Ligand binder design. Sequence first.
Ligand SMILES: Nc1ncnc2c1ncn2[C@@H]1O[C@H](COP(=O)(O)OP(=O)(O)O)[C@@H](O)[C@H]1O
Ligand SMILES: Nc1ncnc2c1ncn2[C@@H]1O[C@H](COP(=O)(O)OP(=O)(O)O)[C@@H](O)[C@H]1O
Ligand SMILES: Nc1ncnc2c1ncn2[C@@H]1O[C@H](COP(=O)(O)OP(=O)(O)O)[C@@H](O)[C@H]1O
Ligand SMILES: Nc1ncnc2c1ncn2[C@@H]1O[C@H](COP(=O)(O)OP(=O)(O)O)[C@@H](O)[C@H]1O
Lengths: 141, 124, 145, 232, 48, 144, 336, 134, 96
Amino acid sequence: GIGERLVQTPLTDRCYLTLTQALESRMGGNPFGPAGTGKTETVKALGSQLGRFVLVFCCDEGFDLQAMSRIFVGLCQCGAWGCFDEFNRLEERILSAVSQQIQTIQVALKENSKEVELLNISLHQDMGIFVTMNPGYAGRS
Amino acid sequence: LVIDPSGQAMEFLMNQYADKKITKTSFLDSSFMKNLESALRFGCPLLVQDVENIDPVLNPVLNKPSFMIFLFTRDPTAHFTPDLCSRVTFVNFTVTPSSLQSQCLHEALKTERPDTHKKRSDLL
Amino acid sequence: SGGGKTTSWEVYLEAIEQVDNIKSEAHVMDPKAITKDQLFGSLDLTTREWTDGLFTATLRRIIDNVRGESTKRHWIIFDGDVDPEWVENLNSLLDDNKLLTLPNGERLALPNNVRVMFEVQDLKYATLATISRCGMVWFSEEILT
Amino acid sequence: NIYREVITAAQGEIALEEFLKGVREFWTTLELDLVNYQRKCKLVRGWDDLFNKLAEHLNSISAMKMSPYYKVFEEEANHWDDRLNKVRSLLDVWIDVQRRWVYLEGIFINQLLPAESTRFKSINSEFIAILKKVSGAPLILEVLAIERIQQTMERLSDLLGKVQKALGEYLERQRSAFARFYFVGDEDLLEIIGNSKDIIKIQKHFRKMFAGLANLTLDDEKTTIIGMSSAE
Amino acid sequence: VFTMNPASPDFHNRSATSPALFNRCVLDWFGEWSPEALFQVGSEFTRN
Amino acid sequence: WLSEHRPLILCGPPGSGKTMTLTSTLRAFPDFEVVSLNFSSATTPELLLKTFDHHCEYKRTPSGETVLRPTQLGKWLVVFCDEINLPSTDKYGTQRVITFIRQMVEKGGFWRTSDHTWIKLDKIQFVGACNPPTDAGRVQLTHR
Amino acid sequence: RAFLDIFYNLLNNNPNLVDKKDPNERLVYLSKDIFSMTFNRVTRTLLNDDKLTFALQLTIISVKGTSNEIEESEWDFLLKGGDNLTSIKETIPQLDSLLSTTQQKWLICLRQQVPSFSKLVDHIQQNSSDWKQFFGKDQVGEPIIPESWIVAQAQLSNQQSTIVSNFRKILLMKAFHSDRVLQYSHSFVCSVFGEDFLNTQELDMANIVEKEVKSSSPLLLCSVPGYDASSKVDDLALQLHKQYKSFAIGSPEGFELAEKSIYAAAKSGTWVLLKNIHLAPQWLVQLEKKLHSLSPHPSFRLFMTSEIHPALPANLLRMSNVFSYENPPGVKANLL
Amino acid sequence: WIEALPEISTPIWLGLPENAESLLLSNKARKMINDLQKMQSSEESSSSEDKGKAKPLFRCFEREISTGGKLVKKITNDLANLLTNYLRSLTTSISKGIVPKEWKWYSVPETISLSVWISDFSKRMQQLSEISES
Amino acid sequence: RIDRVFRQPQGHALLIGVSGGGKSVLSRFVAWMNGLSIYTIKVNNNYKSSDFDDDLRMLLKRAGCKEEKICFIFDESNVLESSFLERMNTLLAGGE
Ligand SMILES: Nc1ncnc2c1ncn2[C@@H]1O[C@H](COP(=O)(O)OP(=O)(O)O)[C@@H](O)[C@H]1O
Ligand SMILES: Nc1ncnc2c1ncn2[C@@H]1O[C@H](COP(=O)(O)OP(=O)(O)O)[C@@H](O)[C@H]1O
Ligand SMILES: Nc1ncnc2c1ncn2[C@@H]1O[C@H](COP(=O)(O)OP(=O)(O)O)[C@@H](O)[C@H]1O
Ligand SMILES: Nc1ncnc2c1ncn2[C@@H]1O[C@H](COP(=O)(O)OP(=O)(O)O)[C@@H](O)[C@H]1O
C-alpha cells in the first residue's frame, strides 16, 4: 500500500549491508543497541524494500508459545520475515523455548535444506528471522 | 536431625540399619508420603533428605509402633525455625579442622601400620 | 493535584463543539481502578476465550457506529496513575502504528476522530518508553492562584 | 480387665459405623449439580468437589480395613469401594465427553465436512437423550444405574475424540493449502472457513495474512473481486 | 486463639499486616518458662 | 462535612475515639445506614466492591443508565473504612482501593468490568478512619 | 568425599608407593606426596590463572611447622599488601633521591609491617649503588634484588632458609613491581615442590572416565563461552566401544524425555550426555537432587556439558569431576 | 611455518606496545592476591569511625555544586547513623570491600577500592570549592 | 486469663510465647471446659488458599448457622500464605 519508508541514513545503509550480506549467508540478523535507533524499523524497512512480508513479534509481554510454534510454519512456507522486537525481553523459560526453535530453523536453513524438521515443514529461501535487542555486556552479545 | 554435609553420617546409618531395611526417601518425589506410612506402621528405619523443606504434616510423629525417622540436611548453615528446633534432636556432623585431622590419623595408622592396630584392637 | 487539569480539557472540549459544532465526547477512566487485564483484556488459557477490556471496548463502540460515534470527535482520558505497565499495550497506537492489537490478533485500528490522553499527577514511575510517543502539557498549580 | 477391652471395642466399632453413615447418606441422595447450557442442555458442575469427596471416602474405606473392628462392616465397606469407584470412573470419561462435546458443539461449515458432521449427530443425539435421564434423576447412584452408561460414555468419548482429531487434520490441510492461514489462530480460522461466501465477514481478517492488503474490492454486483485496498 | 512465638523470623511482620490481632483479642504473653517453673517441672517429673 | 457527603477522614491514634465519635454523630441523621469495613494491607478495590453487592443494588434508571443505590429505599449508605491508610501499594506506589474511591467521589461512578457500563452512585457516600502515616504498616495517602 | 580419595590413593594406589614397603620410610613420601596428588586432581578444575593461586596455599601449608615456615606477619603482608597505602602521611625524605611520592609510602608499609623488613630503609640508604637499578626506571634488565640485601637480611634473622628468603622477594616485588609478583611466586612455589610441580601435565581421558571415577559422580565439563566440549565426549565415547545418547537440554521436549535415558543408563550402565545445561538454569537443580540418590552400575558414566555459568547449582559440580576448558595463550596456538 | 612458530607470543605481535604485558601481569598478580585475602578471611568493624573524620558556564557550575553538595549532606547524615531496608545494605559493601550503592552519584570505575573512592570524593570536593570564591 | 477471653462475645486470644510452652495445650483445656470445640487446620507443604477458604466455611457455619461453641486455635505455622491473615483479620473484627 502506502506504508512507511525510513530515511536512508549512512547508518541505515551500513545496516542494510550487514543484514543482506549476512542474510545471504543463510543466517538471521541481530541488530543490538540502545532502544530507539531503528533496530526494528530498519529491519521492517528492508523487508518492505524487498517486497517481503515482515512480521513484528512483540516480546516483553505475554508472548504466546503455542502460537509462535505455529506461526513459524507460516514464515518457513510463505517465506515471510520474522522480527522479534526486544527478543531479549522474553522470560528465561520462554526465551529458552523460542531460542531452541530458531536454532532448528536457522541451522537447517544454512545447509539449503528444502524442508526443516521444526516441531517436517517446507522451508522457503526468502524466509528470514530477525532478533533485535539491547547491547550485551562489554561487547558480548 | 543430622546436619551432615560431608555425607559421612548418612553413609553410616544406611550401613548400620541395613538389616532393618531403610528407605532413602526425601521430601521430594511423591513416593515420600507413601514411604512414611509404610515404614511407620510396618516398622523400619527411614531417612528424609533435604529437611530444609519439611511439611507440618509430620509434626504429630515428631512428638509421638516400631520405626525411626532420620531428618537430614546437606546445608551446613541451614537456618531452621523454633518449631522445628524444639521437636527435634539435632546431630551435627560437619567435619571441622580438628575432627578431619583425626579421621586421617586413624585411616593412616590402620594402613601405614596395621600391625600396631591389631595390638590395640585385639588386646583392648 | 488541583492545578486546573480536569477543568482545562473540560472547557476545551465543551468549547470546540461550537467552533466546529461537532460533539466532542470524552471517556474518562482510572487505569488503576481495575486490573490491567480488564483495561485491555486477556486470553483464557483453557478455551482461547477472550474477555474484553475497558479500553478495548470503549475503542470499539467508536469504530462501530452503533449510536453513530463517527459523527463526532472523541477523547479517551486515562484519569489515573501512570506506570510502564498499562501503557506499553498502547505503544502501537500512540505512534505511527495506530492499532491497539490484542493477543487474539484482533488488531483494533485507531480512527482520526479519536484522541487518547492522560491526566496523571506525576510520572516518577514512568520510563522514557511510556511518554515518548505522547504530548506533554505541564499544568503547574501556580496557575490557579 | 476384660471389661475394658469390650467397652473400647464397642466404641471403636461404632466409629466405623458412624463413618459409613455419612457415606451411605451422602451418596444415596447427592444429586449431580447441573446447570443450564444456553437452552440446549445441562452440563455437570463442581467436578473437583465430587472428586475430592470420592477420593476422601474411598481412602478412609480402604484404610479402615486394617482395623480390629473392620471384619464387621467389611461387606458394606467393600460394596462402597465398588460403587464409589465406578462413580469416579464414569465421571472421568464424562468430563471428557462434556468438554469434547462443548467444543465440537459451537462448530457443527457442516456442509463441508459431512463425513464428520454426520458422525457427530449420532453422538449429539443419544447425548441429549441420555442427559435427560440424568437431569430427571440427578441421583449420582441412579444415573450410574443406566444401561451400561460406562460402556456408553466411553463410546461417546472415543467417538467425540475421533471427530476432533479429524478437525485438526482438516484445519491442518486448509493451512498447507494457503500458507498465510498459519497466521490466523484456529479460532478466527474456523470463522474464515465458514464465511467462504460472505466476504464481508472476512474483510476484518485480511490484515493478518497480507502486508498492505487490508480490504478487497467487489464489483457493483458484490459477487466478483475487482481489486484490493490498502489500510492507508 | 492466635498462638505465635516471639522468636519467629516474621514476627513484627505478621502484625502490621493484620491490625485486628493487636487490637481485638487479648494478648496474654506466655513468655518463657520462668526459672521457678523449670524447677517445679523437674522435681515433679523425677519424684518416683 | 457529613451533610455534603464528603469522604472525611478521622485520623488519630489507636483507641483515640475515632470509630466511636462517628457512630454517635451518625445518629443525628434519620436516613443514614452505616456499614463498617475493616481495611488492611490486602484490602484492594475488589473487596470494597464485594461489600456493595451485599448492601446496595444495581438499578437501571428510566433514562437508560444504571445507578448503584442502597437497598433500603430513601437511605444514605455510609461506607466506613476503618483502617483506610493500610492498603498496600503496587510496584508503583498506588493503593488501587484509594484510586477506586477517588473515582467514585470526584467522578461519581465506577466501571463494571463485565458489561463495561458506567455505574453511577445514587446515595452512597464515604467516611474513613486510620492512624497517622507516621506509624508502621501505614502508607501515606495520595494527594489526588 | 572427593578429597578423601586423593588421601586414599596416597596411602594405596600411589604410583611412587608401589615399591618400598617399610612404613617408617614410606611416611617420608606420603608427607609430601599429599600436596602433589591433591594439586593434580584440583588443577583439572582450576582455570589457568587460578591454577597458581591454589599452588601457593598448598605451599605455605606444606612448609608449615618447619624451618621453612613463612612468618604469619609476612604472609599477612602479601595479602594485606599495604592496602591502606592511600593514607600514609609519614614519609622517607632522606631518600627522595630515589623513591618517589607513592613509591616511598610502600617502603614504609613494608618496614611498618613485617619485622624482617625494618632494617631495609637503611640497607637501601647505604649501598644505594645496588638498589639503583631496582627502583631505577628505564631498566633494560628486569629489576633485580641486590644480593647484598638478600643475604644481609638472611643473617639479620635466624631465618637463614632458602624457601623463606624466596617468599620474601615477592613482598618486595609486590611493593615496587606488582608485575613480577606472578613470576616470583612461581619461583617460590617451585623451590618448595620442584619446578616440575606446576608443569601442567597433559590429561588422559582414558584412566579418568573409566579407571579413576565411580559411576556415582558424572563429569561436568564447564567450557568457556565461545567453545563447545560436545565433541570431546563423542570422540572418546565411540573410540572406546560403549552406548550413548546425547540430548539438547534447552528445548521443551528435552526436559522429561531426556531424563529417562539417564535413569536406564545408570540402571544397566550406559554413557549419556547433556550440553548447554546452563540454558536450563531452573532444571539442573532438579537433576542434582535426583542424581544424588541412585546407585548406578559400575559401567555408568553420565556426562554433562556447558560453559562456566553461575546456573550450575553448587550441589551439582560438588558431586562430580569438573573439567575446566579455556583457549590457551600465544598466537601460534590460535592459528593451529 | 606455523608449527615452527614459538609457543609464547609477546604483545608486539598484536601491534601493541611491549609494555602491554606488564599491565596484564600486574592485574593477574593483584586478582590472585585478592583471592588469597578472601580464602584467608573465610578460613579465620569501627571503620566508619575513621572515614567520618573526612567530608554561560555559570549555569553548569551552579549545578556542579548543587547536585554534588547535596551528596555531602547525604554521606554525612547517612554515615553518622553509625551509632531499615536502606541503612542495612549500605553497610554490607563497607564490610565486603565495595562502595555502598546509593553513594555513587558520579562516574567512577566499577572496581575501585573503598579507601580510594572516599579519598577522590574528598579532593573532588575541594574542586567545587575553589570555584565558588573564584 | 484464657477462660476470661472465652466467656465473652467476640473473645479472642493472642498468646505470644516460646515454643512448646503450653500455648495450645493450655488453650485446649480452658476451651474443653466452657463447652468449646477446638478446630485445627491440618496443613502440609502442599496446601493453598483455595483450601483455607473452604475450611473457613465449615467453621463459619458451625458457629453462625448451627450456633456452636468452637475454639479456633490458629498457630503461626498455619499462615502458609498471606491471604490467610486477611481472612483471619476480618473474621476477628466483624466475625465475617
Ligand atoms: N533512518 C531513519 N529514518 C527515519 N526515521 C527513523 C530512522 N531511524 C530511526 N527512526 C525513527 O526512530 C524510531 C526508532 O524506533 P524503533 O526502531 O521502532 O525501536 P527500536 O529502536 O527499539 O528498534 C522510529 O519510530 C523511527 O520513526
Ligand atoms: N479559572 C478558574 N478560577 C478559579 N477556580 C477554578 C478555575 N478553574 C477551575 N477551578 C477550580 O479548581 C479546581 C481544579 O481542579 P482540576 O485541576 O480541574 O482537577 P484535578 O486536580 O483532578 O485535575 C476545580 O475543582 C475548580 O472548581
Ligand atoms: N467521650 C467519650 N465518652 C464515652 N466513652 C469514650 C469517650 N471517649 C473515649 N471513650 C471510650 O474509648 C473507646 C474508644 O474506642 P473507639 O473510638 O471505638 O476506637 P478508635 O478510637 O480506635 O476508633 C470507646 O470504647 C469508649 O468507651
Ligand atoms: N506445665 C506443664 N507441665 C508439663 N508439660 C507441659 C506443661 N506445659 C506444656 N507442656 C508440654 O509441652 C507441650 C506444648 O505443646 P503445645 O502447647 O501444643 O505447643 P505451644 O506451647 O508451642 O503452643 C505439650 O505437648 C505438653 O505436653
